[model samples]
Target: KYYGNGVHCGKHSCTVDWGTAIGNIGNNAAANWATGGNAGWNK
Candidate 1:
């Protein structure tokens, strides 16, 4: 249900750079103890 397509970032939808996005997700999961931000796997 969570997986979907990518949209470019803008005023309405900001597209994330691949590396930054991965880093953010990793940091979030590691620091926040959360899971499931594995958008990198999709790429």
Candidate 2:
């Protein structure tokens, strides 16, 4: 849920100070994490 904030880690964790981002497999993958979508394999 901390997209613009910084790199998202696990629950209650993030590397926000670095202001970096984690790589996604594809556009859909990025979309998935952005919206916390957790349905199917790449929901």
Candidate 3:
């Protein structure tokens, strides 16, 4: 939820600060966390 605020720690619970990031593989943020799509196992 708190995407841009400052030092935001995506943990169980806490305050927000400054920072940002994500990953490849889908990278979808929703009612939970930013998830990543798998390319393949036998890659």
Candidate 4:
């Protein structure tokens, strides 16, 4: 229900980079807060 998969970032569809919690936080801390955090990087 959050992060990656073109999830909404306000009105625009977030890119794969923007969707990852790591991309948002610049570290794995936020990634742990979200999903596996590694799923979005499969690209």
Q: Considering every candidate listed, which one attains the maximal lDDT?
A: 4
Compared with the true structure, what per-residue lDDT tens digits does model 2 show for residues 1-43?
A: 5556655564446656443323223454656656665641222
Off-target runs (Cα >4 Å) in candidate 1 are 1-17, 34-43
What order do you get sorting by lDDT, best first?
Answer: 4, 1, 2, 3
Question: Model 1: what TM-score?
Answer: 0.35
Model 2, position 6, has a per-residue lDDT of 50
Q: TM per model?
A: 0.35, 0.20, 0.15, 0.17
Per-model CA lDDT versus the true structure: 0.50, 0.47, 0.38, 0.52
lDDT, candidate 1, 1-43, per-residue tens: 1233455443344444454567676767775554455443324
Tell me which of candidates 1 and 3 scores higher on TM-score: 1
User: Candidate 2, TM-score vs. the true structure?
Assistant: 0.20
Question: Candidate 1: lDDT of 25?
Answer: 62
Q: Find the 10 residues in a row with the least total lDDT in model 2.
A: 17-26
Q: Please give, for residues 1-43, the per-residue lDDT of candidate 4 as tens digits.
A: 3555655555465545454554546655445537766554434
- Each prediction's total of clashing residue pairs, residues at least 3 apart in sequence or on different chains, is 5, 0, 5, 0
Clashing pairs in 1: 9-13, 9-14, 9-15, 10-13, 10-14
Candidate 2: RMSD over Cα atoms? 10.2
Residue lDDT tens for model 3, 1-43: 5666644556644445432232321233332233242332122
Please report how far candidate 3 places residue 17 from its true position, in Å: 4.8
Lowest summed lDDT across 10 adjacent residues in model 1 is found at: 1-10
